[PDB]
């Protein structure tokens, strides 16, 4: 029974809490206090292995403090989440990787790029563009919908496998 620490990061409104609550509680919260930053725990079987998931749903202001640095540093993998209909969030994905590589002191930190709200009728970020950025980073890319559960397990579980392969 292994303990895996996952940090879900992303810009304001992308669906971090929505995605996390779906994983933990199997329902869709279409409105959740955006200030609430919590840790959650879930036990799951991933490839026949009982896993202990410690998911940190980040929310707080993107402040750069020594506590926030080691608070993030405890994470083994990071879900980098943008919304497919929010270009500024996708442009943020670069800076997020930068902070991840800094506190972790590594160019090879387990990440998964998540395009959320892929249930939407339209979008302003095309899949090909994100896959390019994912390749240019050497990380997976998953489209998810916290509204319908599409790819939610796929996204989180894939971060776990990326953590496995790191040791």
């Amino acid at each position: 029974m292994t303990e895996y620490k996952l940090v879900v990061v992303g810009a304001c409104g992308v669906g971090k809490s929505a995605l996390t609550i779906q994983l933990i509680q199997n329902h869709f919260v279409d409105e959740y206090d955006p200030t609430i930053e919590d840790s959650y725990r879930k036990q799951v079987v991933i490839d026949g292995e009982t896993c202990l998931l410690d998911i940190l749903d980040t929310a707080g202001q993107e402040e750069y403090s020594a506590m926030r640095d080691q608070y993030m540093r405890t994470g083994e993998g990071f879900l980098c989440v943008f919304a497919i209909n929010n270009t500024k969030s996708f442009e943020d994905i670069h800076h997020y990787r930068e902070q991840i590589k800094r506190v972790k002191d590594s160019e090879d930190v387990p990440m998964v790029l998540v395009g959320n709200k892929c249930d939407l009728p339209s979008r302003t970020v095309d899949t090909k563009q994100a896959q390019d950025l994912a390749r240019s980073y050497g990380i997976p890319f998953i489209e998810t919908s916290a509204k319908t559960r599409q790819g939610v397990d796929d996204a989180f579980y894939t971060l776990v496998r990326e953590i496995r392969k790191h040791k």
Partner: antibody, heavy 122, light 110 residues
Framework: EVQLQESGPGLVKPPGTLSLTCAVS?????????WSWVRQPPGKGLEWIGE???????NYNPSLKSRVTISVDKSKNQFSLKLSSVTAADTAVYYC???????????????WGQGTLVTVSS | SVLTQPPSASGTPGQRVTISCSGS????????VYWYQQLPGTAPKLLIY???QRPSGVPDRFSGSKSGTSASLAISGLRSEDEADYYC???????????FGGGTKLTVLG
């Protein structure tokens, strides 16, 4: 950041049962932390009462075990304390607290309510 | 209280003051110690966690250590704003509960 607030009868008559409720906002009760009750007789030191996890598991101060019940009401995002057979020894300020983070341990009392004075008296 | 602290401590400003905390093999000897500072009429605030780590907002003149079944809080460069009550806490394996010291009231002299 999470915030806790105690509320309960200021006065409890002996034989009676002290009943308190901790309203929690800015954080889900289903988070991976432990929710504690701590008390402090006026002018004296802190005494841990007990703690509960959101699944329902509890650990009580063994010295209070036969009189303490702690509950969680996820639907109201509250946990609660019931302490039976009160005596004057239970007169104290009662605090609720969250701590014992699964993510990064800072100890058992990361966040405190303001505390409510309960007087036990005839 | 299960842990033992001196009820009071003194110091003139600028000095270094230490506050001791003694337990047994089943609490301090086995587990981490945590320190809390309580000001008049307010809830306690975490001061030191895991024997010697400082949370956000605790200056480096506060420091803690732990040896065997004893733990120690050190305050160097004592200031007037340090007048408070200081409490140690640890998990006790035999009681299966959190135990405290009785608390130390720190007075800044002069």
């Amino acid at each position: 950041e999470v915030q806790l607030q105690e509320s309960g009868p200021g006065l409890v008559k002996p034989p009676g049962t002290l009943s308190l409720t901790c309203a929690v906002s800015g954080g889900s009760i289903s988070s991976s932390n432990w929710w504690s009750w701590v008390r402090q007789p006026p002018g004296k030191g802190l005494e841990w009462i007990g703690e509960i996890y959101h699944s329902g598991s509890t650990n009580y101060n063994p010295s209070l075990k036969s009189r303490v019940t702690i509950s969680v009401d996820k639907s109201k995002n509250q946990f609660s304390l019931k302490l039976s057979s009160v005596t004057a020894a239970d007169t104290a300020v009662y605090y609720c607290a969250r701590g014992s983070s699964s993510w990064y341990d800072l100890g058992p009392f990361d966040y405190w309510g303001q505390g409510t004075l309960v007087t036990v008296s005839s | 209280s299960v842990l033992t602290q001196p009820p009071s401590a003194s110091g003139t400003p600028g000095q270094r003051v230490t506050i001791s905390c003694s337990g047994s093999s089943s609490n301090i000897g086995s587990n981490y110690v945590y320190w809390y500072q309580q000001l008049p009429g307010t809830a306690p605030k975490l001061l030191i966690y895991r024997n010697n780590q400082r949370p956000s907002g605790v200056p480096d003149r506060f420091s803690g250590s732990k040896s065997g079944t004893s733990a120690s809080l050190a305050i160097s460069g004592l200031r007037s704003e340090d007048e408070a009550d200081y409490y140690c806490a640890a998990w006790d394996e035999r009681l299966s509960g959190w135990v405290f010291g009785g608390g130390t009231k720190l007075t800044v002299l002069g």
